[PDB]
Amino acid sequence: EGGPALFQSDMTFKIFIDGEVNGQKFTIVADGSSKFPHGDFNVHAVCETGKLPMSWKPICHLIEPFFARYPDGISHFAQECFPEGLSIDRTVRFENDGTMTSHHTYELDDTCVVSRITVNCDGFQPDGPIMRDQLVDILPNETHMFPHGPNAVRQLAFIGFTTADGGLMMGHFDSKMTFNGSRAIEIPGPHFVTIITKQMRDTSDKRDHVCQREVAYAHSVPRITSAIG
Amino acid sequence: EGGPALFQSDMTFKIFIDGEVNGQKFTIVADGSSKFPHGDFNVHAVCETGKLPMSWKPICHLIEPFFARYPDGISHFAQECFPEGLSIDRTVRFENDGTMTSHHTYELDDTCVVSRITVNCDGFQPDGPIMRDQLVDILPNETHMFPHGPNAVRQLAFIGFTTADGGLMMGHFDSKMTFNGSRAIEIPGPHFVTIITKQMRDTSDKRDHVCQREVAYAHSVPRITSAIG
């Protein structure tokens, strides 16, 4: 159909991540489900190459924007991109550390959104908290969504990770979501997506197994009018 | 510890800004009021050097974090800083344009806060919308507040400005607020301060000026407990 019509039911998803950090190759496969009206969903991820050679925390954003809950007043761009699908190009630059560059494509097969991601994690510090797995949690944040020409939206974020030492590791997140079709698509005005994440290490024998939950919902913050009260 | 106790009063403020943009000096003086419970106040800002050489819009954040409204449950660092006061060092880097670097000092004189700001605006594009006065509005945004060691807090923000042709100019805002005293000050956990800003002209002031209203309030996004439920 077109857009949200296709998300009025319970859905699933599958993710394949092709990655490398500092030259070390890794593979992640994940799946989960999201039940209408969405905005609170879980993912079960497995490192198919064994032990993840970095913290799982910075993986959080790689392992579903179309499953955020949107208000009626804001066009849900990520949902509207279907059936043609969407691409995502993203950088997260960590202060005093490496930068993750990812390229994502999303496709809908029935009620399953399949994602294929390539990711390059370059110039990470071997003795920093990312490579030494010293990130403890993932801070809640208020991502910013901006129109980005006639066929895309830009998502800007500050993704902080608290460290064992009690400090913060800050990533500067810059993501472009692009519509893959030729038909005219509505581009939402500026808005926000609150994102709350919790990751859990699961029973794992030879492969890392991590569960992650995310609550994600949009809001806006509208203008003021009178400028003397 | 005390401090937020002082702000239970109605208060006034005065701002002196010593600036330059592309080797052109300017001077701005501003004043206004804010009444408890704060969070919604006006400033009258005047260019004392004739005509301001750049858009007034990117001056919006130079022309009072202690007048944000905080709820019970989030420590108001900017208020916790008094009576000793605080300083700010801030960078706003505009995409494809210049960088504003500012040093602020805030001192309490009974119920007046006096701020002194020096700002260097360098590498701004003479044919860009900042130098050409082609910014039309300031986008409301969700600024992110983080602890920064034991005597400071960091405010990160994406401040967008609409241009006259319908585009967007994005500034990347990074501001460190530092306590100017020796005692142990309570440092808040990560949170947000929503900032909504609007500039207008007073018809009866013939000087180059703006009147600016700002609504600012803190809020927190509660973390989730289970990565499943």
Side-chain angles (χ1 to χ4, degrees):
Chain A
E1 298 285 297
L6 303 159
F7 291 81
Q8 305 280 195
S9 76
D10 290 8
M11 293 170 85
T12 58
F13 62 104
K14 180 73 165 199
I15 304 154
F16 308 88
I17 294 144
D18 183 14
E20 64 77 27
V21 56
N22 284 4
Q24 294 179 68
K25 294 189 174 133
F26 65 86
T27 305
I28 296 175
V29 182
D31 63 83
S33 73
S34 183
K35 47 334 221 146
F36 184 82
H38 307 298
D40 190 339
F41 58 101
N42 274 64
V43 71
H44 306 273
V46 171
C47 183
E48 299 282 13
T49 45
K51 171 85 173 157
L52 197 71
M54 56 183 301
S55 177
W56 272 96
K57 270 59 171 89
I59 307 308
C60 61
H61 60 92
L62 300 181
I63 61 183
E64 322 287 299
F66 34 78
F67 291 144
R69 191 164 178 185
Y70 263 59
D72 281 278
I74 300 165
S75 188
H76 199 333
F77 178 82
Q79 293 187 354
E80 300 282 356
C81 281
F82 295 93
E84 296 84 331
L86 68 141
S87 318
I88 299 185
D89 296 321
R90 178 182 296 176
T91 59
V92 183
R93 166 185 82 76
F94 291 94
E95 308 187 339
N96 308 123
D97 214 314
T99 294
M100 303 173 61
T101 300
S102 55
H103 298 296
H104 313 201
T105 69
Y106 297 85
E107 175 158 68
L108 181 64
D109 182 345
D110 202 20
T111 57
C112 182
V113 184
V114 183
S115 66
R116 306 190 175 280
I117 295 173
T118 176
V119 62
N120 286 162
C121 305
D122 302 327
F124 287 82
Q125 307 301 100
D127 298 317
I130 297 165
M131 301 301 285
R132 291 172 62 174
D133 192 15
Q134 293 172 309
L135 304 182
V136 187
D137 55 41
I138 295 162
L139 292 188
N141 55 105
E142 287 287 4
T143 73
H144 288 48
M145 301 279 278
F146 299 102
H148 197 74
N151 296 305
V153 298
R154 186 183 185 187
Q155 182 179 34
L156 285 168
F158 299 116
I159 45 179
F161 299 92
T162 60
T163 69
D165 291 343
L168 293 178
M169 173 44 74
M170 188 67 37
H172 295 251
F173 175 115
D174 190 350
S175 189
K176 292 40 172 38
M177 300 193 278
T178 301
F179 173 49
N180 297 159
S182 53
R183 74 174 155 92
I185 187 160
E186 188 191 348
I187 308 298
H191 67 276
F192 315 81
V193 179
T194 310
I195 304 182
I196 328 173
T197 314
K198 178 114 192 140
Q199 220 177 55
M200 188 202 294
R201 190 156 208 81
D202 216 330
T203 306
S204 313
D205 198 315
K206 283 205 172 196
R207 332 227 232 40
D208 283 1
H209 275 255
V210 192
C211 303
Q212 181 180 289
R213 176 182 175 212
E214 187 167 284
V215 169
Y217 44 104
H219 64 93
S220 43
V221 171
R223 292 116 204 73
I224 41 204
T225 337
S226 181
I228 306 205
Chain B
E1 300 151 28
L6 319 173
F7 283 85
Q8 276 166 324
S9 51
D10 302 350
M11 278 160 102
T12 56
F13 63 98
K14 184 79 159 172
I15 316 162
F16 302 91
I17 299 157
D18 173 21
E20 67 167 23
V21 60
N22 292 176
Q24 288 171 73
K25 304 283 178 196
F26 60 91
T27 296
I28 298 164
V29 181
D31 70 285
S33 270
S34 185
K35 262 155 274 150
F36 183 87
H38 301 300
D40 183 356
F41 67 112
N42 305 140
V43 60
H44 186 213
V46 175
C47 179
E48 301 196 329
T49 50
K51 174 102 179 135
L52 187 74
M54 61 185 293
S55 174
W56 272 103
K57 302 304 198 276
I59 303 304
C60 68
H61 60 97
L62 299 181
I63 62 170
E64 319 285 302
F66 36 76
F67 296 142
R69 178 177 330 104
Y70 269 60
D72 287 22
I74 303 168
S75 188
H76 199 332
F77 179 84
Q79 294 191 353
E80 295 281 340
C81 278
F82 297 83
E84 301 91 330
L86 70 150
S87 53
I88 301 188
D89 291 291
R90 180 180 294 172
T91 302
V92 181
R93 173 185 78 74
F94 290 92
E95 308 185 341
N96 317 121
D97 215 313
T99 294
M100 298 172 67
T101 306
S102 57
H103 188 250
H104 319 207
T105 55
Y106 297 90
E107 290 282 345
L108 182 67
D109 187 7
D110 185 22
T111 64
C112 189
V113 184
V114 174
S115 44
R116 304 178 192 281
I117 294 168
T118 157
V119 59
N120 290 99
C121 303
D122 299 324
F124 281 74
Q125 288 308 295
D127 60 344
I130 294 179
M131 300 311 290
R132 287 210 50 208
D133 194 19
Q134 294 165 334
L135 302 178
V136 168
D137 68 29
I138 308 159
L139 296 197
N141 56 92
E142 293 279 12
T143 73
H144 291 48
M145 294 283 192
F146 299 97
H148 198 60
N151 287 286
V153 295
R154 191 185 188 192
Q155 190 177 24
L156 286 168
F158 296 115
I159 312 183
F161 300 87
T162 302
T163 72
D165 61 22
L168 228 171
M169 163 63 71
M170 182 61 45
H172 294 260
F173 171 117
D174 187 358
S175 191
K176 179 193 66 202
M177 297 187 269
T178 313
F179 172 44
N180 278 343
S182 88
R183 59 147 197 262
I185 182 156
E186 156 74 280
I187 294 198
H191 60 283
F192 314 91
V193 178
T194 307
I195 305 174
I196 305 146
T197 310
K198 173 106 177 150
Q199 292 178 354
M200 84 171 286
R201 314 281 207 0
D202 173 3
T203 36
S204 79
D205 186 341
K206 267 88 186 147
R207 305 171 285 178
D208 186 5
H209 68 99
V210 295
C211 302
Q212 182 176 288
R213 180 177 181 189
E214 177 165 294
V215 172
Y217 53 93
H219 72 81
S220 54
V221 164
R223 304 179 253 2
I224 47 177
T225 339
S226 61
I228 57 107

